[PDB]
């Protein structure tokens, strides 16, 4: 099935997904470290395909960009 | 059997610019004391930094604001060089409201009784818009050296602010040779201080050696 | 087969520390081996240091 980006993340605690939004998606201005996850994904298998910042690489989320197929849903953030 | 030193003189050339004078000091302790006090100073002194920056409508540093003339980083990096002096707490918070084009500087930041601007002119932004008005929450805290913000272990806006609590500048020191009563051996050391007007001259020689009496007190009595 | 594409740009403050390489425009290059305190660095007369 289609790949899922939302903030219901299986086997995360609600600790790890406080600089989400409801769609899922980090927001601006959120200070991230290694691990940190930027955009929850769940790919069905539901296995946890989120994007997470990469080890040793803490930095300030500056711009988020969301493009959309034609015909998909965009989301909240969108 | 030792003559040990007195303070004699204090000449404040400028606020953040002095000499103090130390007389009388036997062969060899004018450079000891000297070097040990110019290193207690550069490095141990206590002062209050900016540590934390709330700017209304910023979420970081990376962005610009409607109306300003820096950008959210170099005003972040104007206040990093904020003198300030409080008095009776370790960590303040003051308020900065301005409006209209113009300079907005330390002198504008609300006036707090506790807390003193030692340099008034110093400039945190440029407002250059009729319509443009900016509103920050400044925290200040007291500390000594470099504590990067990257090492200290808070919502979205919080900026934080490395650290450089020392108010001291630059130490220099001279020996000279001070006509004693009778005894011609004898010294002075001149230390030239240039702080950033926050210490006063006085409390920071005295606090230098009270670290290292404090320090020598394992080897006074080793064990 | 891409239903969605997010991109997040990620900021980061890189400050000098010991192992990153410093070089002139006369090809003196080398890697930083040290950040020295200050009052341990060389300083003149007028008590500035390097």
Same mark, same amino acid.
């Given at each position: 099935?289609?790949?899922?980006?939302?903030?219901?993340?299986?086997?995360?605690?609600?600790?790890?997904?406080?600089?989400?939004?409801?769609?899922?998606?980090?927001?601006?201005?959120?200070?991230?470290?290694?691990?940190?996850?930027?955009?929850?994904?769940?790919?069905?298998?539901?296995?946890?395909?989120?994007?997470?910042?990469?080890?040793?690489?803490?930095?300030?989320?500056?711009?988020?960009?969301?493009?959309?197929?034609?015909?998909?849903?965009?989301?909240?953030?969108? | 059997?030792?003559?040990?030193?007195?303070?004699?003189?204090?000449?404040?050339?400028?606020?953040?610019?002095?000499?103090?004078?130390?007389?009388?000091?036997?062969?060899?302790?004018?450079?000891?004391?000297?070097?040990?006090?110019?290193?207690?100073?550069?490095?141990? @002194?206590?002062?209050?930094?900016?540590?934390?920056?709330?700017?209304?409508?910023?979420?970081?540093?990376?962005?610009?604001?409607?109306?300003?003339?820096?950008?959210?980083?170099?005003?972040?990096?104007?206040?990093?060089?904020?003198?300030?002096?409080?008095?009776?707490?370790?960590?303040?918070?003051?308020?900065?409201?301005?409006?209209?084009?113009?300079?907005?500087?330390?002198?504008?930041?609300?006036?707090?009784?506790?807390?003193?601007?030692?340099?008034?002119?110093?400039?945190?932004?440029?407002?250059?818009?009729?319509?443009?008005?900016?509103? @920050?929450?400044?925290?200040?805290?007291?500390?000594?050296?470099?504590?990067?913000?990257?090492?200290?272990?808070?919502?979205?806006?919080?900026?934080?602010?490395?650290?450089?609590?020392?108010?001291?500048?630059?130490?220099?020191?001279?020996?000279?040779?001070?006509?004693?009563?009778?005894?011609?051996?004898?010294?002075?050391?001149?230390?030239? @201080?240039?702080?950033?007007?926050?210490?006063?001259?006085?409390?920071?020689?005295?606090?230098?050696?009270?670290?290292?009496?404090?320090?020598?007190?394992?080897?006074?009595?080793?064990? | 087969?891409?239903?969605?594409?997010?991109?997040?740009?990620?900021?980061?403050?890189?400050?000098?520390?010991?192992?990153?390489?410093?070089?002139?425009?006369?090809?003196?290059?080398?890697?930083?081996?040290?950040?020295?305190?200050?009052?341990? @660095?060389?300083?003149?007369?007028?008590?500035?240091?390097?």
């Amino acid at each position: 099935g289609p790949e899922e980006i939302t903030a219901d993340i299986p086997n995360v605690g609600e600790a790890a997904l406080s600089k989400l939004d409801e769609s899922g998606i980090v927001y601006i201005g959120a200070e991230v470290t290694g691990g940190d996850i930027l955009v929850g994904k769940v790919t069905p298998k539901v296995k946890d395909s989120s994007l997470r910042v990469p080890n040793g690489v803490s930095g300030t989320v500056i711009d988020v960009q969301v493009f959309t197929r034609d015909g998909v849903e965009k989301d909240k953030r969108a | 059997e030792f003559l040990k030193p007195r303070l004699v003189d204090i000449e404040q050339v400028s606020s953040t610019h002095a000499k103090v004078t130390l007389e009388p000091l036997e062969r060899g302790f004018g450079h000891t004391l000297g070097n040990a006090l110019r290193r207690i100073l550069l490095s141990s @002194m206590p002062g209050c930094a900016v540590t934390e920056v709330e700017i209304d409508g910023v979420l970081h540093e990376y962005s610009t604001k409607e109306g300003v003339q820096e950008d959210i980083l170099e005003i972040l990096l104007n206040l990093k060089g904020l003198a300030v002096r409080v008095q009776g707490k370790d960590e303040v918070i003051l308020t900065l409201n301005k409006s209209g084009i113009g300079p907005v500087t330390a002198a504008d930041i609300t006036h707090d009784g506790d807390v003193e601007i030692v340099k008034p002119q110093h400039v945190i932004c440029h407002l250059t818009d009729e319509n443009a008005s900016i509103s @920050m929450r400044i925290k200040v805290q007291r500390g000594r050296g470099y504590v990067p913000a990257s090492t200290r272990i808070r919502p979205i806006g919080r900026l934080l602010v490395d650290a450089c609590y020392s108010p001291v500048e630059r130490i220099a020191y001279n020996v000279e040779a001070a006509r004693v009563e009778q005894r011609t051996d004898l010294d002075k050391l001149v230390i030239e @201080m240039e702080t950033n007007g926050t210490i006063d001259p006085e409390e920071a020689i005295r606090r230098a050696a009270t670290i290292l009496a404090e320090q020598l007190e394992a080897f006074v009595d080793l064990r | 087969g891409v239903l969605k594409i997010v991109k997040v740009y990620l900021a980061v403050k890189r400050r000098i520390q010991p192992g990153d390489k410093m070089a002139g425009r006369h090809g003196n290059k080398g890697v930083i081996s040290k950040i020295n305190p200050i009052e341990d @660095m060389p300083y003149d007369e007028n008590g500035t240091p390097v």
